Symmetry: D2
Subunit: 266 residues, 4 copies
């Protein structure tokens, strides 16, 4: 006779969990996550901002890299998120407990975060993580300012209802650099058409392709660096092959159209 199956842990490619030292993107912006998961530190004269944290087991590594950059736990003021799945918001609860950081997110991301990713529209309870509360709810196009760096929220619903692109302007060589951190545009294993949990899913993805295409975007970064052709292990040429926001959106839409056609056939 047969017991119910054991719970299955959320396991990922080893490179997603491979720690790296801080990689500078612009004058105040650093990649401090792992080889294949983005976690951006923005350092200001008035505290630091973290955008995404990667997987749940990455908290101490993130804190180590912040320390290397001169950022103590007290100095981290704000956490922002691309979307509230386990491999990007994983360590948020722990980071809040261990730092001064407060979380700002839109309503959709906040409720999913507060559920620890449970009851996912597509994944069910398959990919959960420690829940956390948002300290501030943001609306589309709203700005948040830290130490004089201005972050703008651009909603791009689809991958999750609360998927967000964050944009800000840094400097490099005395010139402004408009950085766009665009969320995933993938739909891995999703039912796209006639999904009872997400009836306007296709319309939202189409709108989000257009949103991403139009972002202020000298430099594109994505939660999975491979999606924008970043190679965090490539040192001085880490960002050399990076896509434009236009190319990223076009590639995503072509892939999406292919998935729709396969779904109709399958």
């Amino acid at each position: 006779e047969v017991p119910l199956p054991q719970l299955r842990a959320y396991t990922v490619d080893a490179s997603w969990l491979q720690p790296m030292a801080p990689l500078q993107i612009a004058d105040h912006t650093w990649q401090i996550g792992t080889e294949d998961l983005t976690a951006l530190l923005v350092q200001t004269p008035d505290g630091a901002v973290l955008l995404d944290g990667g997987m749940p087991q990455m908290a101490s590594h993130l804190l180590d890299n912040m320390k290397a950059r001169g950022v103590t736990p007290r100095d981290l003021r704000l956490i922002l998120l691309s979307h509230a799945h386990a491999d990007h918001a994983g360590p948020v609860a722990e980071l809040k407990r261990r730092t001064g950081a407060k979380v700002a997110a839109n309503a959709e991301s906040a409720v999913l975060l507060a559920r620890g990713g449970s009851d996912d529209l597509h994944f069910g309870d398959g990919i959960t993580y420690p829940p956390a509360n948002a300290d501030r709810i943001v609306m589309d196009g709203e700005v948040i300012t830290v130490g004089g760096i201005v972050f703008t929220a651009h909603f791009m619903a689809g991958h999750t209802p609360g998927s967000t692109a964050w944009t800000w302007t840094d400097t490099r060589n005395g010139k402004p650099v408009r950085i766009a951190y665009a969320d995933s545009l993938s739909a891995p294993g999703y039912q796209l058409q006639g999904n009872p949990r997400y009836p306007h899913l296709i319309e939202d993805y189409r709108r989000s392709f257009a949103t991403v295409r139009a972002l202020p975007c000298d430099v594109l970064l994505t939660p999975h660096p491979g999606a924008s052709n970043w190679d965090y292990a490539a040192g001085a040429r880490a960002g050399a092959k990076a896509l434009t926001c236009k190319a990223y959106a076009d590639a995503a839409e072509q892939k999406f159209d292919g998935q729709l056609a396969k779904e109709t056939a399958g």
Copy 2:
């Protein structure tokens, strides 16, 4: 070079996950969980009560057994908990989504439940589950009435701050049967003395031994049946060897005293 470790799933003995058909305890009280995890269904002319649900993957099994008893999802009115760890409160979030059930718990259990068991005083984030919200907060000694069956809360903090014994009176052969569902009194791997997260841990356990000893208790049940010498696979003699509440409390205190002495030596 070395990636961070993969997340590890909460795995348990196979018997904890072995489904069983409903086993009657008294006229309206049934064990409907697995061979080694208690989940009690109390059926009234005015809806049903569930006490504990076991592991997260047990939700559909529980619903199957309720169906066998004549209880539809709409008929489940109340979920009560011994304590809010993954192997007793595991399926609560899913049960709430799939039934009419509302959760009643004390403040300590409610906040741990709302965290999905994360930031545990002793386990950290090692044993998490889908978070759920409590619909009603109960105080020590408070009663809840369903279809005329009266449940009384008896706080017995220690195993968790919110650990609770639930008592009610059923019938068997035209005679009243005072059922006591007493929580765990174990402290598995806990730092008992001078624990910064639980400074009065020892005092609370001592008080809880006394509480359990004094419960109205014709029949004792526990979240792990083995703790009270139940054998759910033993049919007509499933409860024959069951401990009294007095014996259960005495055994727990003797084990506890032994652990304290070992901790001092270790």
Copy 3:
């Protein structure tokens, strides 16, 4: 010398608080709120649904009217909301405590409800009420089915980010009646242009006018009956003068355009 001002209660026109007996709209749909606040009861062979509850002090009145309709507290299964302001979601927390009802709402409404209407984008903390938790989060276009009556959510953001129209089909004289419960389209005292808390406010209102215009709509109802030209005190001719959804949307847009012009001038 001068103390800080006393807290000021949210007071409303007397007619908003004037109880009325149940007024039938269609075969299973009744107005059971007050003369000037809508609260719709939909009764099915499988439980009842409430859409809106009005002000916080209306809970017992609502329960009285449900009782008159043959609906006991146990029978109320679902609460739906137009938007989560105090004069429509006021008694929700109390209704949940006193009935079997669970709340379904979109993410925006759920977070505002969970705040008890505090930190409002426009009202600040001026209009608060007892907070409540949502049991189910719904997406745009999603359906919920109770006793065979199908409710469809139509997001119409503007008055609040989470403003929703609910539609369902009832019967009257053996013929189907498509009922549309459309949310408010007012913007009372709002800063419309360049609002830092709601940067796309105007775009959202414009989209919502179009949404409301296109609803399936044999009969329009609104949270304030006056907005759709209902007169709940007028008995057999209560709904005689009711607007179409098209007329309601056109009137709202004309008023909105006038407010925009005044704001530019003011």
Copy 4:
């Protein structure tokens, strides 16, 4: 005919709302609330702690006094609470939005705070305020350290289930001063005996009298200064007439015994 009553605002004595300039208690401890509501600022080389905030409309005043003390919004690290009623936790939600502050509280206080004081065991929904979330849950006897000042939690349930005394050691004239901020021991209009919402209320009050009696207590402060015979308007002799913790506990118990006798007679 008769409308339902208007909502009634929580109004208080004018002196409760009378702003005062900061009054020094010890080397790093200041009263910064109003004449008749305590709000203590503790300033450390590593950030500031606030204990209580008074009424909801006191937020800006508190921020003004912090500014006068050299504490900017970014500098406020921690909010602690005596108990989560509107006249002590009132401005907590707003303070969190406007400062770097995180809230630490026990489970009972956290759930009441998260409800904005609604569904009070004794007051119902009569005295509500903006809800806030706790960032850290503390256990009885647990310590929290800020800038080297150590705060110890002493649970003293009764006035609310989550009522807490906070103790710490400051200095004055090169000598240590053990400060005890003890919560209210009043029971205003409470049903004491056989209260279904608080069955062990009397036992908890008795235990709390003993707890307060035994606190480390060179200087006693209370949320209402009058309870400990403080006079915040009396300048250099503000604390001259202050009770010991022993005298405060004895007075509270005598008053309590009198109320019990009156309740039995009434």
